[PDB]
Amino acid sequence: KPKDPIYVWAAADVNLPGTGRPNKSKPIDDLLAKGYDKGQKPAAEEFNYILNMSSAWVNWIVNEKFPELEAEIARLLAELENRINQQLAV
Amino acid sequence: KPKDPIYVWAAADVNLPGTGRPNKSKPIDDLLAKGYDKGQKPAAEEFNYILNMSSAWVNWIVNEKFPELEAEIARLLAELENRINQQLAV
Amino acid sequence: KPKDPIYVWAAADVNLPGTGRPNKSKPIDDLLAKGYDKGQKPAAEEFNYILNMSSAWVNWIVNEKFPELEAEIARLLAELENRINQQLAV
Incomplete structure (x- = not known):
């Protein structure tokens, strides 16, 4: 890990x-479709933006998505057990 | 988010x-293990390949694996509830 | 996929x-909060460190975290089904 x-x-x-100017900017779609070439050169804004997007999405996947998915998984089973046991007691 | x-x-x-050449080429495994050093200047193909890796896989995780996984867990819970419902019906 | x-x-x-020096190093948070500015000279250390972080965290999630969650879901569903099956058998 x-x-x-x-x-x-x-x-x-x-x-x-x-x-x-803002420290981050979206690269133009044409550049995303193909990427850099020999002559073409990177700009600071696009360079920062790519890494920022990657890291932010990695955060959203790790520290946000899995915890709440696990909480939802537990809650679903708890509610199902409650619903079944109500009828069983009946 | x-x-x-x-x-x-x-x-x-x-x-x-x-x-x-094709816009993306796989870096030689030596470089993958090692990385760059001062004086080196990256070739465009390896740069594009690495960024495509790190972006496409996050896209897959966000838009394919999870939307699949929530649906699957919901369907599993629904089917277990259904089975217990036929069991109760008698 | x-x-x-x-x-x-x-x-x-x-x-x-x-x-x-080592081939990887964590950038100072000062730079992490801002990003590369005009005229700065990127060092292979920071680039390698960030790529390492991103790649490792991607593959950990892809190969380990998802199978674990699936196994947990399967075990939870099986045990939950078994409880109600036994109780209704009683």
Whole structure:
């Protein structure tokens, strides 16, 4: 298992001092469809955005989705048992 | 939760005029184990391949495995309840 | 489903051949909150560390966490069915 907590990249949403523009931006769809080439060069915004999206979704999967799915699993069984046992007592 | 739909990097596979090669190529396992070092500058194919990996698999997890899993658990609970219902009916 | 058998990037933990420092290092939270700015010089250490984190956390979820949850669901359903079966037999 992974040994360390999962940090987000460029978590904050602020204007960078060097640029004065938001630290993250969506890459243009055309670039997503194909990616970089020899001559083409990466921009800071897209670079930060990709890693930020990856880390944020990893958080949402690990620390959010599984815990609540487990809680729902337990709750479903508890409610089913209650419903059945009511009739059984009847 | 994050407010952007998961976009798979380099989803399409095509030849790039700059390289003439497929947009994604598998890094040699030596590099996978090792990684980069100062002075190295990545080849576009490996970069695209890695990002496509990390994005496509998160997309799969979010949009295929879970929507399947909640439906499956719900159906399992419903079928167990149904069976107990036929058992009670008599 | 993705065709890629995901692999861990920089899975080996050794010092760099040209630099005595390790091949991976956690970026300072200062950078994690902001992201690379104009004119910054990315180091292979941070790139390798983040890719390692992402890849390891993806494959852990894919290969371990889901089979565990499925086995737990199956066992819970079987035991729950058995309880009511026994009680209705009584």
